[PDB]
Design a protein around this ligand. Structure first.
Ligand code: K
Ligand code: K
Ligand code: NA
Ligand code: NA
Lengths: 246, 246
């Protein structure tokens, strides 16, 4: 009939890698109508549909989950139906030939979110590095399971890597975590440093400066409630050198 | 092996209607990867892919054609490989629940094109009125084969229905030819009236006014060369009443 198992993000990662054999797998978008079917070669559609496909893959393996009603904020899937603060999964996809084109989240929303819901910082990002050839055959060249702090970095002029347009801050932007090329700007080494960057960015950004004063304390108390454990966020000025050039 | 037939636009229209049974047919976009396949419910992708599907349908029925290298101008298919001025096919698709969302062509380009290539006015438009339900099943609710003059009309403030933004003319826009509701603005009754609208629109539009003086003569001579037959384009002022309100 129906025997539904509960899985974690690491089990899903490992299952796709070993059991599905995702790295060697082949796939393609296809449109059927009447008695004719054709390949579909629209390249931008692949990234939006991998998330839907994992949905179908989970649902076909009887794996237990809920879906997120908010597209703007993480997560995409709740892997624990009874605990919606833990076992949280975000699916991301980008064309592997170029740098990662996905966004993490609007900075203003995310800086507020992680005070109210610090457990969002422990969301797992299942990232598909996909590729589509000229014939339309889609393949997953790379697959990753990473934390938000593992896929972001600092930038020039701001504490965290941002999308800034005409001096106005928008979305937190990912770095190139996978490159063996050792740049002057590496990814954040730990959660505390990422959060330290967020803290300072709150003050740097004129839009979010109004709630910069209390931010550190408010976050550390909120982390304590939800995790029953203190966390020490270093000052950005002390740790900035690890992530900048000079 | 391969027995390839030559068809005309009306034969293709009738074949789809009776032999394919397009009106009662069912279809859907679908993404395969590994061993999981899912429905794809992105609604904007359907319109772009019907054109590709007809390509596949022609190619699977051994039907002879060439494809157009220019997306901005008609046609999409050349149904006569030896005569690329005749048997020209444009495929259009719109969601049947709303009014037609497709464009005919940029007006500046099209006003110049029909002097150099008057045979473009005899292009056949195979128009798919499609629909996608909540489950993702695509159906062709209506199918039409029409001329450009049968799917356009006048508007308020210009001789032909246009997309105007801040007093700047862009694309020729289709009317609602299919509606049994008899509006004050009907579609053009014949080719000559459509062309009369184009002629006047050339002068009305400040961008194309520089070549408005000679336009009528230049067009009528060009029509004569290509068709070996004179054509009389009426003055727009005389016929405007048929297409306006007052
Ligand atoms: K997001
Ligand atoms: K066109
Ligand atoms: Na979400
Ligand atoms: Na074309």
């Amino acid at each position: 009939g129906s025997h539904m198992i509960k899985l974690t993000a690491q089990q899903i990662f490992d299952k796709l890698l070993d059991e599905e054999k995702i790295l060697s797998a082949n796939g393609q978008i296809r449109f059927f109508l009447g008695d004719v079917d054709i390949i579909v070669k629209q390249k931008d559609v692949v990234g939006n549909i991998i998330q839907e496909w994992l949905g179908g893959w989970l649902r076909k393996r009887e794996i237990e989950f809920d879906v997120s009603t908010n597209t703007q904020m993480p997560p995409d899937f709740f892997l624990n139906k009874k605990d919606r603060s833990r076992e949280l999964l975000e699916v991301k996809a980008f064309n592997r030939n170029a740098s990662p084109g996905f966004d993490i989240a609007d900075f203003k929303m995310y800086s507020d979110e992680i005070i109210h819901k610090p457990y969002m910082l422990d969301v797992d990002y299942l990232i598909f590095g996909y590729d589509m050839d000229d014939n339309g055959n889609v393949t997953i060249k790379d697959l990753w399971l990473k934390k938000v702090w593992q896929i972001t970095r600092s930038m020039d002029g701001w504490a965290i890597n941002l999308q800034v347009k005409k001096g106005v801050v928008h979305k937190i932007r990912p770095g190139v975590w996978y490159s063996i090329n050792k740049k002057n700007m590496p990814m954040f080494e730990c959660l505390e440093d990422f959060v330290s960057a967020i803290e300072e960015t709150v003050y740097q950004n004129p839009a979010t400066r109004h709630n910069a004063s209390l931010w550190k304390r408010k976050f550390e108390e909120a982390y304590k409630k939800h995790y029953n454990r203190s966390i020490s966020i270093p000052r950005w000025h002390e740790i900035a050198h690890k992530y900048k050039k000079k």
